Design a protein around this ligand. Sequence first.
Ligand SMILES: Nc1ncnc2c1ncn2[C@@H]1O[C@H](COP(=O)(O)OP(=O)(O)NP(=O)(O)O)[C@@H](O)[C@H]1O
Ligand SMILES: Nc1ncnc2c1ncn2[C@@H]1O[C@H](COP(=O)(O)OP(=O)(O)NP(=O)(O)O)[C@@H](O)[C@H]1O
Ligand SMILES: [Mg+2]
Ligand SMILES: [Mg+2]
Lengths: 121, 121, 234, 234
Amino acid sequence: MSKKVLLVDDSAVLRKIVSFNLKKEGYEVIEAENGQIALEKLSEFTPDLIVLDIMMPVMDGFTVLKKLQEKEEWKRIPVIVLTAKGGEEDESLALSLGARKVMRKPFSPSQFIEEVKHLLN
Amino acid sequence: MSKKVLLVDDSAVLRKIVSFNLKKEGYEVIEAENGQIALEKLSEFTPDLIVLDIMMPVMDGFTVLKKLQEKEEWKRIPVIVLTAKGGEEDESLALSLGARKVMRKPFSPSQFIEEVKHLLN
Amino acid sequence: LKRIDRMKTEFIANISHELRAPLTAIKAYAETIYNSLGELDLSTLKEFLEVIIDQSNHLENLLNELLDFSRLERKSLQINREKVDLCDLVESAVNAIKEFASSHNVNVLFESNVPCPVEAYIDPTRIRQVLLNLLNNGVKYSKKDAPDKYVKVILDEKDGGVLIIVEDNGIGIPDHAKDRIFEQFYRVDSYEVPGTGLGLAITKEIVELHGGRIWVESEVGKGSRFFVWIPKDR
Amino acid sequence: LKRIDRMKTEFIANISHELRAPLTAIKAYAETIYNSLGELDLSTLKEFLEVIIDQSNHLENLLNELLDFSRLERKSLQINREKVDLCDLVESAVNAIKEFASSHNVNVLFESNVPCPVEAYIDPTRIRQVLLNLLNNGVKYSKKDAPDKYVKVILDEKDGGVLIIVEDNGIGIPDHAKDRIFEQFYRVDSYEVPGTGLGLAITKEIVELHGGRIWVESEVGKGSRFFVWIPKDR
Ligand SMILES: Nc1ncnc2c1ncn2[C@@H]1O[C@H](COP(=O)(O)OP(=O)(O)NP(=O)(O)O)[C@@H](O)[C@H]1O
Ligand SMILES: Nc1ncnc2c1ncn2[C@@H]1O[C@H](COP(=O)(O)OP(=O)(O)NP(=O)(O)O)[C@@H](O)[C@H]1O
Ligand SMILES: [Mg+2]
Ligand SMILES: [Mg+2]
């Protein structure tokens, strides 16, 4: 009865260290290299928590957020935005697009997992 | 009997990582926080290889090199210069002041160790 | 009349100076742990790892100064005010830098001439950066040869607003440069000290955006004192 | 009149972009190893350590680019010539990029129309930087994800000097931007691609200091071909 997490980012170097620290807590990891692939995986199941990058090719993280608050089957999914953007414009924008929390890069892994558990409860 | 080297640098963080890799090959490490202290510890004994920083408080590395190749007991001591100053003229000046090799920061520990073993023959 | 372009190119070499030292530590300590796994006890392994993590935070400070510099040119630096206890916020800042000052031996004391709590309508994140910036400068530029080295903040409430003081026994700012220390890129040139000149410029912008001012009173050799006045703005 | 100050500040922000990604990796991997020492198998431990060393070398390339930028301003960059077999020099550069190329799915070639050795009085250190720069760009701005991605190096000697061509299946340079990519800080801003802008600027300086010149032939979608001509010497 473990939880599954949808990890979305364009850098495999990031997805490696995040999939490791997520599986540390007994979670399942489903990766996606861009935002379009992330939506293609969202049709096969429904994740418990989504980790979303903003700067990505093909489909960025903003469009994924709008399409998450659209289809009412995903509108109640907690979304964490792990982006390199730091301006107050980008954070408040992702917040209005249905995201629960936005964390800048670089990020502390202990604080990230702490927020992942705070949203999974 | 084990070899002895004189480690000269103002950064205690660098002295530790160089003392480790120098002791990894079986050498004895004698630290000195600046160039003036290095000359003081040059009175208790005579090392077989000296690692010298350039930018140091009190006494700089160029002054240590000039004081070295003018006193006979210190003239034949091989000296590697591990400096952050990777300038064009900085290398040629230290080489003219009697240094046997000038290495730049950041450096590779394996490359630096192999050069230490080169001068110790 | 645009000599500012001449000062920006020096800011480049200052970035490379701030980047050259922690990169030497990250590269050396990482290759050491790799090629010397069998020559590491668990203590030195964690010690080398923690040295790697400490240098990344130095570079993280360098990254955040480049971003806040981009916000001073954009003039887009904004404050988000909360109702924060001041003595609580200054304790959280003094607690953090206590360990860094221990690596260079400096007693970080905190006195309050007013009774805690001291609530105010300020941004806790940027004010904490102001505190951590003034305290990082008080310990770094503190004299080396000296016994009982200290740096003390004082909470006070003068002229309606809140007056914070940061005293230290540092080397002291000369009477000719005490005006330009707040201008961008400016630094008291006197050896291998890393710096970019933006610490007090962002500190000045944060305090003045809060509705107040900041000035400095220091003596050559004796010590340095920074003053920060901010209204409560309830 | 003086937009060089404007193009310099954008290059400042480019330094922060180049610093943000490897720092996030160094911070994440070095902190995972520190907290998960009891959960890291030796394969993942060395793999995470290997990532830290790789990202530190990415930042080391950033440090050396800022130092070389400080040499283009002072006009202090000099070359130190020595008779080096060019075949052994290019074969030493296609292998120092072959691993980084296989990561981004692309291979290197070397079709020399003249039999080796090819001795020339050049600076092998700076010319290796010229080759590694054109190869790294031949794999960074390569094709989107098309089949058969390669980067070719053609050694030749025409018009009394040595002529090298770096071919690739890259995205191609638009004809409106082909006459300014060598200008400093310039970059065809057509997303998640790191870019400083002065990569070809240092490449142009090294080639012109060697006595020769360098130009570019490119078509949109067809690929890119950089031409470097350096005379032989005594
Ligand atoms: N507590 C102090 N005592 C004596 N001198 C100081 C003190 N704080 C600052 N100064 C001087 O004033 C200048 C302040 O420059 P600043 O704007 O802090 O750039 P910086 O030194 O690069 N800060 P940072 O980037 O955070 O290390 C420095 O050149 C110091 O010499
Ligand atoms: N092999 C290539 N194929 C297509 N375009 C290229 C190639 N090499 C360079 N360019 C173009 O040249 C422009 C700038 O290149 P350059 O001056 O080297 O800066 P840079 O590559 O961004 N900096 P760095 O990668 O850090 O050295 C980019 O906008 C590219 O589009
Ligand atoms: Mg990204
Ligand atoms: Mg030093």
